[PDB]
Amino acid sequence: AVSASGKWLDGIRKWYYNAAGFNKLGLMRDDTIYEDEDVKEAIRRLPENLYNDRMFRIKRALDLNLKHQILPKEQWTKYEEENFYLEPYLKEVIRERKEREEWAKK
């Protein structure tokens, strides 16, 4: 609930965001998430163009990892640049699982 200290939180989140290396590979935040079955169904529900963008950026990341190189500095993902595309879908899936479970315990 902090104010300016919350801006400080934005600062440390930005620094930690640059501490994570996926920006070096062009990845969006959501590409990095571990793909358990909930995430699997979450990816299944993605719109085709977005799913294509995801698969291609994943290939670009793996390909850069092949030759142990790095994406050029101009092309790095920026902290404000990201679109958190997978969140609504994954939240729908997880909420559905929690609903099925809460029904299942009764």
Partner: protein, 378 residues
């Protein structure tokens, strides 16, 4: 219609080797796994030619090895390739487990558990095999390790004498250890087949941690020569350890005959066990030291349960990476402490190192994982 697809043996080789998809971006660390697969063969073949002269009687076990190192032609190279070979085996083993702990490979829980059981098997094998030469450290190590079994509260000594085959360590114990040492590695091989069996229906993990289905590639063209180079470097480091400095990973005193009467000073077990041994040195209680010992290796099974991060690899999560290298440094600390006589400086550092070794991976790692979760806004 290739013949690989027709004949069943060529089918299975077409699966396990020639054609199975792998992530393209696999690095040098995964190679260690295959290296272990290689090491076992060496440890068999080489060892197979030591069994042809070794006599497992207590009265002649030492002189027979003198017969191998001296009288037998080219016996000493087999001796040293074998002994150093076990050390390289555990080095590749530790690096392998560290690789599996670092990149979040433990999520393949069944493969993980088979790896743990196979680990305990290799440990028992190395122990009984180290008992075989029948030197000072060999005999004494056996007495010290065996007594731990005596720790168990009710069954204890009856069970311990059941291992000894007598009141005290002697020839029958040596013969028994020769048999189990002979038999265990092949069981380790069958487990390894199970290990690869569970492994391949999901596929090998990649360093990024993201699924690599978009960039799968056949194993034969690339990783066979990559593993050829890794095996070549392995033989390089092994032959350099054997032909230039055979002894330094070993311990003098083994070249002396075992004395049931006399007792050697430093009494240090061979290096790969040392850290575990420190834990025995750390807890004053007997049974408590035994349970802490069993927890020291079992603890690996609890790791998947303790996982909290929504990612696999540490590489995108630097804080946990720092905890990881703290853990490695701590293992170096214990490994060094195992080589030292009890004294004020050592006992305090050993206890702190052990407690830190348990607390860093039962407490700090999940919590900083949660912190890494909150920092990334999900």
């Amino acid at each position: 219609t290739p013949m690989r697809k027709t004949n069943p043996l060529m089918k299975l080789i077409n699966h396990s080797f020639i054609d199975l998809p792998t992530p393209s971006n696999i690095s040098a660390w995964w190679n260690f796994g295959s290296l272990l697969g290689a090491c076992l063969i060496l440890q068999i073949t080489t060892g197979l030619f030591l069994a042809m002269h070794y006599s497992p009687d207590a009265s002649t076990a030492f002189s027979s090895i003198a017969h191998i190192t001296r009288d037998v032609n080219y016996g000493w190279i087999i001796r040293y390739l074998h002994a150093n070979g076990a050390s390289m085996f555990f080095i590749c083993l530790f690096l392998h487990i560290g690789r599996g702990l670092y990149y979040g490979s433990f999520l393949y829980s069944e493969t993980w558990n088979i790896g743990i059981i196979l680990l305990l098997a290799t440990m028992a094998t190395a122990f009984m095999g180290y008992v075989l030469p029948w030197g000072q450290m060999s005999f004494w190590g056996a007495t010290v390790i065996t007594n731990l079994l005596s720790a168990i509260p009710y069954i204890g000594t009856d069970l311990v004498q059941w291992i000894w085959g007598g009141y005290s360590v002697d020839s029958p114990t040596l013969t028994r250890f020769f048999t189990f040492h002979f038999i265990l590695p092949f069981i380790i091989a069958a487990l390894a087949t199970l290990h690869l069996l569970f492994l391949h229906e999901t596929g090998s993990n990649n360093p990024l941690g993201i699924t690599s289905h978009s960039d799968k590639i056949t194993f034969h063209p690339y990783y066979t020569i990559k593993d050829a180079l890794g095996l070549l470097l392995f033989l390089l480091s092994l032959m350099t350890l054997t032909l230039f400095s055979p002894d330094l990973l070993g311990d003098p005193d083994n070249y002396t005959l075992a004395n049931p009467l006399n007792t050697p000073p430093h009494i240090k077990p061979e290096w790969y066990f040392l850290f575990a041994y420190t834990i025995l040195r750390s807890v004053p209680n007997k049974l408590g030291g035994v349970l802490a010992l069993l927890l020291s290796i079992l603890i690996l099974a609890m790791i998947p349960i303790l996982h909290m991060s929504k990612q696999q690899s540490m590489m995108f999560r630097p804080l946990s990476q720092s905890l990881y290298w703290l853990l490695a440094a701590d293992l170096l600390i214990l490994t060094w402490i195992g080589g030292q006589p009890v004294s004020y400086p050592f006992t305090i550092i050993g206890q702190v190192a052990s407690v830190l070794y348990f607390t860093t991976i039962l407490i700090l790692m999940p919590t900083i994982s949660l912190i890494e979760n909150k920092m990334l806004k999900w």
